[PDB]
Amino acid sequence: MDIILGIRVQDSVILASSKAVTRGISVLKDSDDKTRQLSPHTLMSFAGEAGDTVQFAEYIQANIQLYSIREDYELSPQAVSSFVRQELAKSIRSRRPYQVNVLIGGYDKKKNKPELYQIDYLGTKVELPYGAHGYSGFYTFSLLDHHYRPDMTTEEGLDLLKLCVQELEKRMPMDFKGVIVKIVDKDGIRQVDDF
Amino acid sequence: MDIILGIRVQDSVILASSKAVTRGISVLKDSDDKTRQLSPHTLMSFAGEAGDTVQFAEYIQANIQLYSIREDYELSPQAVSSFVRQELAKSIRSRRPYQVNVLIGGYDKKKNKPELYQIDYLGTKVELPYGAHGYSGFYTFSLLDHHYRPDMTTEEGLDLLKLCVQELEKRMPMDFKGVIVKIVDKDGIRQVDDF
Amino acid sequence: QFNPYGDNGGTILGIAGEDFAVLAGDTRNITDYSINSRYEPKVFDCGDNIVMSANGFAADGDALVKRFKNSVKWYHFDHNDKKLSINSAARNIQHLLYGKRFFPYYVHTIIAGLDEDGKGAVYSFDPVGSYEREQCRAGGAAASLIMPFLDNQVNFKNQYEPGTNGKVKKPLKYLSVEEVIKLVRDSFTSATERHIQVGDGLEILIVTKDGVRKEFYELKRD
Amino acid sequence: TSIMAVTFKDGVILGADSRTTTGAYIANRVTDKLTRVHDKIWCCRSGSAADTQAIADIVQYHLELYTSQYGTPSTETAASVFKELCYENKDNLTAGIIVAGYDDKNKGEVYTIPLGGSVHKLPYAIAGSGSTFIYGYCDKNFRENMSKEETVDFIKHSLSQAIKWDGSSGGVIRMVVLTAAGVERLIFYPDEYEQL
Amino acid sequence: TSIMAVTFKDGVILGADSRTTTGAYIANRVTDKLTRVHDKIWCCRSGSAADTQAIADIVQYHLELYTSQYGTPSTETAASVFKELCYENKDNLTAGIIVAGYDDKNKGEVYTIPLGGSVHKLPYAIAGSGSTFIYGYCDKNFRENMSKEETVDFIKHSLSQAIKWDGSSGGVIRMVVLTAAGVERLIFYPDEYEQL
Amino acid sequence: TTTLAFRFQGGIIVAVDSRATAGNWVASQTVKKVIEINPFLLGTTAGGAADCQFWETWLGSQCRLHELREKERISVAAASKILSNLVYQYKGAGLSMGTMICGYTRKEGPTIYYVDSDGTRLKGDIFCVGSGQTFAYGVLDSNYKWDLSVEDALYLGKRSILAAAHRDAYSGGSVNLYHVTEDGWIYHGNHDVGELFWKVKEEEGSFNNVIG
Amino acid sequence: TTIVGVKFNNGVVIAADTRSTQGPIVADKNCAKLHRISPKIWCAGAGTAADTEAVTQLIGSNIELHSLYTSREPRVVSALQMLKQHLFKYQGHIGAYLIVAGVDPTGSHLFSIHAHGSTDVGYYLSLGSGSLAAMAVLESHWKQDLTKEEAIKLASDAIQAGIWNDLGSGSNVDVCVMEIGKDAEYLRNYLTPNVREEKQKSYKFPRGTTAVLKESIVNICD
Amino acid sequence: SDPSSINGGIVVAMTGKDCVAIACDLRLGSQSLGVSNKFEKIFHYGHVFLGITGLATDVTTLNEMFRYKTNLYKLKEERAIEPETFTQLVSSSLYERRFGPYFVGPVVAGINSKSGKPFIAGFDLIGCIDEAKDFIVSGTASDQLFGMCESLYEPNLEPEDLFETISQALLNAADRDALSGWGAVVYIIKKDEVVKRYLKMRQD
Amino acid sequence: TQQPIVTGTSVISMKYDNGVIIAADNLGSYGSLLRFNGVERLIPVGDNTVVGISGDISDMQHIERLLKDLVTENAYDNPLADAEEALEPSYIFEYLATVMYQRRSKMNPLWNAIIVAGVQSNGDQFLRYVNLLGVTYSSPTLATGFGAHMANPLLRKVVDRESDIPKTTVQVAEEAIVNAMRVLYYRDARSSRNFSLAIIDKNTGLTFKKNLQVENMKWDFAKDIKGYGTQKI
Numbered sequence A, B: 001m002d003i004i005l006g007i008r009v010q011d012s013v014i015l016a017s018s019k020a021v022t023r024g025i026s027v028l029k030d031s032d033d034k035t036r037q038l039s040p041h042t043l044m045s046f047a048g049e050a051g052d053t054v055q056f057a058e059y060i061q062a063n064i065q066l067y068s069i070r071e072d073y074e075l076s077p078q079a080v081s082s083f084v085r086q087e088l089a090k091s092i093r094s095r096r097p098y099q100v101n102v103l104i105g106g107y108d109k110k111k112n113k114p115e116l117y118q119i120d121y122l123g124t125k126v127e128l129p130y131g132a133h134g135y136s137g138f139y140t141f142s143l144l145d146h147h148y149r150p151d152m153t154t155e156e157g158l159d160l161l162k163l164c165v166q167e168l169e170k171r172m173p174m175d176f177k178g179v180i181v182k183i184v185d186k187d188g189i190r191q192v193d194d195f
Numbered sequence C: 001q002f003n004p005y006g007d008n009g010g011t012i013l014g015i016a017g018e019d020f021a022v023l024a025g026d027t028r029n030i031t032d033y034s035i036n037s038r039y040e041p042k043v044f045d046c047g048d049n050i051v052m053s054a055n056g057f058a059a060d061g062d063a064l065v066k067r068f069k070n071s072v073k074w075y076h077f078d079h080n081d082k083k084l085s086i087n088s089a090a091r092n093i094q095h096l097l098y099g100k101r102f103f104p105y106y107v108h109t110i111i112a113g114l115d116e117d118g119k120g121a122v123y124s125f126d127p128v129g130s131y132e133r134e135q136c137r138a139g140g141a142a143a144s145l146i147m148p149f150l151d152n153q154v155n156f157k158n159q160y161e162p163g164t165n166g167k168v169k170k171p172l173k174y175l176s177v178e179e180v181i182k183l184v185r186d187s188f189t190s191a192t193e194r195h196i197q198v199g200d201g202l203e204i205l206i207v208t209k210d211g212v213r214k215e216f217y218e219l220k221r222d
Numbered sequence D, E: 001t002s003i004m005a006v007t008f009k010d011g012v013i014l015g016a017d018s019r020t021t022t023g024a025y026i027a028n029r030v031t032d033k034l035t036r037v038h039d040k041i042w043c044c045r046s047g048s049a050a051d052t053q054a055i056a057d058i059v060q061y062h063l064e065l066y067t068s069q070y071g072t073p074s075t076e077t078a079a080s081v082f083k084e085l086c087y088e089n090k091d092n093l094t095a096g097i098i099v100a101g102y103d104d105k106n107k108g109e110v111y112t113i114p115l116g117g118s119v120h121k122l123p124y125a126i127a128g129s130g131s132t133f134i135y136g137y138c139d140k141n142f143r144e145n146m147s148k149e150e151t152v153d154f155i156k157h158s159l160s161q162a163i164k165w166d167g168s169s170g171g172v173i174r175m176v177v178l179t180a181a182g183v184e185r186l187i188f189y190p191d192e193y194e195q196l
Numbered sequence F: 001t002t003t004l005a006f007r008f009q010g011g012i013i014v015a016v017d018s019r020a021t022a023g024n025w026v027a028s029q030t031v032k033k034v035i036e037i038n039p040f041l042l043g044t045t046a047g048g049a050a051d052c053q054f055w056e057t058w059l060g061s062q063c064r065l066h067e068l069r070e071k072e073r074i075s076v077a078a079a080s081k082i083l084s085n086l087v088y089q090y091k092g093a094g095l096s097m098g099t100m101i102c103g104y105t106r107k108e109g110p111t112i113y114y115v116d117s118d119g120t121r122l123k124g125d126i127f128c129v130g131s132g133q134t135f136a137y138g139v140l141d142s143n144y145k146w147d148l149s150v151e152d153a154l155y156l157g158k159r160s161i162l163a164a165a166h167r168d169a170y171s172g173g174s175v176n177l178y179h180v181t182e183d184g185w186i187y188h189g190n191h192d193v194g195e196l197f198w199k200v201k202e203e204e205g206s207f208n209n210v211i212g
Numbered sequence G: 001t002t003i004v005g006v007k008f009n010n011g012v013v014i015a016a017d018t019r020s021t022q023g024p025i026v027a028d029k030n031c032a033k034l035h036r037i038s039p040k041i042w043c044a045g046a047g048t049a050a051d052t053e054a055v056t057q058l059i060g061s062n063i064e065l066h067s068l069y070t071s072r073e074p075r076v077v078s079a080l081q082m083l084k085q086h087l088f089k090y091q092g093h094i095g096a097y098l099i100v101a102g103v104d105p106t107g108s109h110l111f112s113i114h115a116h117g118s119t120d121v122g123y124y125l126s127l128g129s130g131s132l133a134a135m136a137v138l139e140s141h142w143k144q145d146l147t148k149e150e151a152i153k154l155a156s157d158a159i160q161a162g163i164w165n166d167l168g169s170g171s172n173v174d175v176c177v178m179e180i181g182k183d184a185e186y187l188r189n190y191l192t193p194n195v196r197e198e199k200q201k202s203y204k205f206p207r208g209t210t211a212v213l214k215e216s217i218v219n220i221c222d
Numbered sequence H: 001s002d003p004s005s006i007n008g009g010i011v012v013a014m015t016g017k018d019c020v021a022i023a024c025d026l027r028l029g030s031q032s033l034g035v036s037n038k039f040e041k042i043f044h045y046g047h048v049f050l051g052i053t054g055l056a057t058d059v060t061t062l063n064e065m066f067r068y069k070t071n072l073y074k075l076k077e078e079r080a081i082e083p084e085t086f087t088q089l090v091s092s093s094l095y096e097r098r099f100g101p102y103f104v105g106p107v108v109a110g111i112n113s114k115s116g117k118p119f120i121a122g123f124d125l126i127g128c129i130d131e132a133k134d135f136i137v138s139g140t141a142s143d144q145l146f147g148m149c150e151s152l153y154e155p156n157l158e159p160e161d162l163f164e165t166i167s168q169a170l171l172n173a174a175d176r177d178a179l180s181g182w183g184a185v186v187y188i189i190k191k192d193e194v195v196k197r198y199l200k201m202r203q204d
Numbered sequence I: 001t002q003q004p005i006v007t008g009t010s011v012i013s014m015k016y017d018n019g020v021i022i023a024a025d026n027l028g029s030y031g032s033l034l035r036f037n038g039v040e041r042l043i044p045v046g047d048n049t050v051v052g053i054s055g056d057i058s059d060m061q062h063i064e065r066l067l068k069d070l071v072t073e074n075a076y077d078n079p080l081a082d083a084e085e086a087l088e089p090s091y092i093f094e095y096l097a098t099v100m101y102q103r104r105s106k107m108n109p110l111w112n113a114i115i116v117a118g119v120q121s122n123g124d125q126f127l128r129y130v131n132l133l134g135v136t137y138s139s140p141t142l143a144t145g146f147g148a149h150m151a152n153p154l155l156r157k158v159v160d161r162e163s164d165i166p167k168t169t170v171q172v173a174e175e176a177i178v179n180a181m182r183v184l185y186y187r188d189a190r191s192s193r194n195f196s197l198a199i200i201d202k203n204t205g206l207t208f209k210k211n212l213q214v215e216n217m218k219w220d221f222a223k224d225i226k227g228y229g230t231q232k233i
């Protein structure tokens, strides 16, 4: 875990997430997918304490999928994010809190609008045009402040994302073994294989 | 500072040293040369505490160069290494010790033999066929145990070194921005520009 | 274990005009929850039209003022009674403070006077010698209360010209000695209300080309 | 605190100073450290004021309920209830209590209960910070079967010295006499005891 | 330790127990804590054995050198040398010393020097761990211008109680009498003093 | 702080913020973080304020003494090493300094040296130093080319400080620009972030995260 | 804080200052520290501000229910017992230091309670940061057989000693008199010796000074 | 690791002639990193306005909690809650977490619909009510706000004048605090109209 | 780095129309033990100054010697040692102040709080404080330790500001001091009944009073107090 990014553009939400899983002085895996599909039009990336991340992500995934079956209806990105925040807001005052930070990228089919939420392990939710967790933000936020426009296309958003990854690969101390990129739009969720 | 390697082959000594200088969450430089020429046929690479490294390396360099002028004669790699060890052996029981680890690669013109010495900040000297400081050794030593032969050529030694760098780039957590390679032989010291 | 530092509270304030400069400070001295003195001055005339205050730990404050006063004396002996300019005094104080970089004087220092063009000048220091000339500075316990008020009223920060669509800023201009003393009195009465270590009395030292004048005003004694 | 209880011919007398401290500040200079848990069973309190107070209240409650069912309790019974509370809650309590009472069968009795929660029946007992300074005096001067006047003098002189040396003790010397006759409260002011 | 020095009509008497402890183990049960720094200037040692010993030796050296040059030193002078060492090395010393001596002009004198390094001239002085238990007794029983026999009894009874209560005190009671007549050493065994 | 300086076709750009902090208290907004050592040498300050101010001023005195003794302006390398050797003597004592020695000489050409309080001394083309160095790096690296014009290079430096001033809570106030050529350093004004931000936002169309 | 309680001929009086602090800052310049437990039982509170409010309300509520249950006017010893048993349970973590006073069918009473749950009795008492300043005045001027007017004067004088000399106390003096046979009179701001002086200047800005980006009407209706 | 100064933020409330004003900054950061410039800290339930500073997760939680509680109130009471009553509800809710508190600095503001009286109030994290005639402050630049309000404020200001005073109090206080700023919002509240203005302030 | 062992408590003082008064009890405490009862903590320097010292007694006795030695040193080669060039209170203070700050600056302080009371040669009243940290201040009333918390409030009711000094007689001033000493005896756990008082008047000179006692104490109301709440008996 370490690098997770998010960019909301005109018609979609793009999430980038590093592939490295390190422990000690060894990179145990370089092809790791740090995300879970909560619903057809909602994707959550995660980062934080080992174990806690996947355990939390799948626990949320299970709950949202249970809701979808029960109501035969997909929860809005706003509704899912509020559910996730409350779970973390409970967690922080537990005997052993989930130390997990997440980004929730989703396409609201009722509003026909993409939405990006950033939530930390304390339960601090914010909607953003672009987001990042961990040390990534210290480079990407200022970069996006400059280059980001609200009316960009998905192709323009991917180039903007390439610009972020290039900067991180240049200035970050740790090797994070590249990123897996995923796009969330009206047609659902798909993965960019060649990045 | 972090990665410094050394391989002694039939007719030369090859030193590889990482180019990254990091502090905090920023790689300040990616083209750093972590070595100093002590004499025409003696090269010392270094790693450790910030500042201490260069300060120590140049302090040794100044002393060896002073000797060379005074006697109009080059000190043997064995003699230089013993001088360096004693300086570190003094240092460790000082008010503020030099926290620097070094590799001394030299060609002895009297014996017509390459020589590689490994010395840590405590003043612990050993002659080796191949050496490494820091976490590097945890990968390279076992690799070289397998692939190293004593009668190898310099070209064979460089391929063996490429094998080490590839492994480190694969399994090391931190990005060390590649290495600068230098060869020490009968004709002196030269740098491999394309690595 | 012995702790060599203490907090004697209070607060100080410096403002510069076109042909004058003021350095104010309350007269209260405290330790913990007790009042030590209701009138203990900490703004001093140091000669050569330089007023000085070193607010925080009074022992370190008095020691510093005492050393600078002495520095002025030896400057005259060594350089033919030459007047110590405010900029020179500032740099000298930096070396006094930094001289104890690894066992500091626990004080926020402010000096005031006139520059060599006759214009008003205020220099301010951190505890280890960092300094900067400004039109405006508040120091000490209630610096956080007073300083933003000064930014607004002396340097006209966040104030735009009415009806200009927040495009044209309020122009900078010097303040009269009458207007400055009004801001000083209001700053200290406001600080006295909300900070427990500030009160009792207010002593202002005004500096013009004619010399150093004093003014005293009562403050709330609770 | 300086506190003590002394048995004698006609019964038992309890004695205490009146100083309560929060650090070096005297929070109360006229404290009543002698407290009634039953008609003729009293106690002296030393240690944490809050702890000894909470304990004495619980004991008073237990003995009132005992009296409702089984009649007047013995002084031993009272001490046992104090012990039970102090011992079972030793980790959370700072209390040093002296229990004194008058039966008609057993006459005067004194039980002392230190920090641990152990019980010790004695002819007389001393406790509290200021007691350290009078172990020598009290040992040399205590006799069994003293008179009322002799015992009052013994306590008055003892606590006078304890007060004189201990900074944590002072004010007035309160006493409580427990005999067949009844219950008598005595007080002695500084002007009297200081110049003994 | 329990130690004390007492002035009286004919001069001054020093008194001490004989117990040295390393924890709860008694390293020496027949210790001589009364030490000579000059003919008729002695001291009682309490606190660190090593510290008080090193100090007493230095003082003995200083007074011997004083005597070589300026004749017999006063008891005040002796106390001043003790003070100077204890005060200037307060950070590294654990010593509580009582200085007692006999002049012909000044008769008997007692100076006590606690941990700080402060000096206090007194009619009598008590010190050491076991002294806490006899502040009450000694204050009530001390009189000025006592006789030799009365003063010996006062010290014997005082140290007997101090020993009885203090675990860090015990063994024999050593005493040293300082008068115009000369120097007399006395000893008193448990079988005698315990049953006082 | 946030300070940067980079080499390019037309010399060296040097840009700094002007904020001073005492924890979360904003101590100053008008602080000078560029020391003019001589007409050809500049020094940037980051870290402990007195430490930087005192020792870089001191450095200026040592550089003056060099040219008096040697009848020749000190080299950027030598100047940087005087400072790095000094702080190395204080290593462990607690000095906090993040400095960049920038200048031009005939033998070296345009040169930048990074020097910090644990003794690190590095020659390089691009450096960003301070609490908001990462924010400046993000904008600078993604827009940097060697073939930048003097006009574009000046703006990129200004824009990089502005980026960090915005995001970093411990950077801001105003931007101080400098340009170093073969002829010496040229001051390019003080730029208040109060006005500069909205001017840049409007004209550049950037900073879309902020409520316009 | 500074709080006091004084007994007199036919009843009891309590008083308090009106300053609340967070660190060296005055959070509230005119807070109410006199709390009503029942109509004729009042409580002065020092320490953790919310604790003195919450604990006094809780016990006040239970006292009211008890009074209705027993068909009797509540007694001071009941409030005392309920407060001390509550505080003791929380081992001092509820940082309430209270002076409990009132009149009831038994007579007039005056007690104090500490955070750990210890209670005292007295004719005159004082608690809080300025209790030493107050107690000094009480020890100097208190006597047996005080009248009503004399007790109010003594009580308010003791609070003033805190106001002026203690930095943890200031502003105004609240008083509450509880006489036997009469209604308790709660004298809010009985003394106000710390009125703010007229400011030197009005800082009313010209309209349009503040730059605006957006405007919008907010819908508060259904 | 001081909950009250991780995210940053400030709130200030004032009273005027037949009106009240409440204002807040927009910053949400993680210590030095500024993350969001849209994070509003003032919420309203009917005609009662509540500003909350401190740890942002709790700011969110308490808003959601008070919306919950005021909604049930309105259903059962069949009327909107008043500022005085709401103030008590906040104090109750905060003290309920005495030994595990919400790390917040809430501020109530509003006009009583029955009496017409302007009302403001502040709280500590544990529930202690701070009622005031003039003004209430809260947040990481509370010192700065206290200094600005105590000097700039006067009684009986008209809504248009009160706006200028409160705005200048917030802006100049925010610029002296590293964790506050990044935009601002001011609510001017009259008896039966509420105007919301976004201020232009320096973005550093 | 020290820790104080044998200690002295409050020293209180105030100005009046013609001079200054200062007082301090005669106790030398050893923690909670009230060890030494014959300790004089007011030390006169010449016939125009009295130095009152609280805190560590070993350090007090060192300061005594320094002052004793200062008088000797001032007399050297000084025909006007008992006249124009006599030791002033302001000279004595500044000397101690210098020492105290130098010692704190070497991390080896004299663990004391000191009040120098006296009258200057021109008739002006001198009263100034200094402590282990080297902190100095002056005020119409000055007090150390518990005196600062309890005495000052009482003494400030007599002399609240500068203008109240001419209006205060020696009778009124001494009464206030003696009262404050009684209050301290009631409330300070490390105080004694016995104390010393000194008056330095510009006309009558130095009056040093020894073996004073706190008297007219109110203890009679104690008999009426019972229990700690409920307890009729």
Ligand SMILES: *[C@@](C)(CO)[C@](*)(O)[C@H](Cc1ccccc1)NC(=O)[C@H](Cc1ccc(OC)cc1)NC(=O)[C@H](C)NC(=O)CN1CCOCC1
Pocket: D001, D002, D019, D020, D021, D022, D023, D027, D031, D032, D033, D045, D046, D047, D048, D049, D050, D052, D094, D128, D129, D168, D169, G114, G116, G118
């Ligand atoms: C003497 C003074 C010392 O032993 C007595 O034992 C005395 C006994 C007493 C007092 C009043 C009523 C009945 C009996 N004890 C005290 O006065 C006591 C000192 C003390 C406090 C706490 C202790 O254990 C932790 C031991 C001794 N004083 C108090 O209880 C006062 C009222 N409260 C405090 O000092 C508050 N303390 C409570 C514990 O935590 C620290 C703060």
Ligand SMILES: *[C@@](C)(CO)[C@](*)(O)[C@H](Cc1ccccc1)NC(=O)[C@H](Cc1ccc(OC)cc1)NC(=O)[C@H](C)NC(=O)CN1CCOCC1
Pocket: E001, E002, E019, E020, E021, E022, E023, E027, E031, E032, E033, E045, E046, E047, E048, E049, E050, E052, E094, E128, E129, E168, E169
């Ligand atoms: C009684 C026992 C306690 O005060 C006496 O003061 C006695 C004095 C004495 C003993 C022999 C000869 C002359 C005078 N003191 C001791 O017996 C002393 C106990 C003590 C040790 C160290 C102290 O301060 C640190 C204070 C009291 N015992 C010793 O010195 C023995 C011989 N040595 C040790 O206990 C070794 N200590 C030395 C200090 O470090 C810990 C180990």
Ligand SMILES: *[C@@](C)(CO)[C@](*)(O)[C@H](Cc1ccccc1)NC(=O)[C@H](Cc1ccc(OC)cc1)NC(=O)[C@H](C)NC(=O)CN1CCOCC1
Pocket: C104, C126, C127, C128, C130, F001, F002, F019, F020, F021, F022, F027, F031, F032, F033, F045, F046, F047, F048, F049, F050, F052, F053, F094, F095, F096, F130, F131, F170, F171
């Ligand atoms: C940004 C604003 C982050 O601080 C910069 O690094 C800035 C650089 C700078 C340069 C020249 C003039 C002013 C400012 N640094 C500061 O403003 C600096 C931050 C800092 C404080 C203390 C430190 O500990 C070593 C390290 C960095 N602020 C100060 O130096 C403040 C004004 N002064 C103090 O805190 C005084 N302290 C310093 C350490 O010794 C004790 C007294």
Ligand SMILES: *[C@@](C)(CO)[C@](*)(O)[C@H](Cc1ccccc1)NC(=O)[C@H](Cc1ccc(OC)cc1)NC(=O)[C@H](C)NC(=O)CN1CCOCC1
Pocket: G001, G002, G019, G020, G021, G022, G023, G027, G031, G032, G033, G045, G046, G047, G048, G049, G050, G052, G053, G095, G128, G129, G168, G169, H124, H125, H126, H128
């Ligand atoms: C005086 C003013 C203390 O200086 C009083 O004791 C006063 C009592 C009071 C105030 C208002 C209403 C009724 C009674 N106490 C305070 O103002 C109190 C001071 C204090 C702060 C912290 C303490 O322990 C950590 C103890 C006392 N101030 C507060 O309670 C303020 C309003 N709240 C905080 O500071 C937040 N606290 C809550 C308690 O836990 C720590 C943080």
Ligand SMILES: [Mg+2]
Pocket: D163, D164, D165, D166, D167, D168, D169, D170
């Ligand atoms: Mg006593």
Ligand SMILES: [Mg+2]
Pocket: F164, F165, F166, F167, F168, F169, F170, F171, F172, H203, H204
């Ligand atoms: Mg910023």
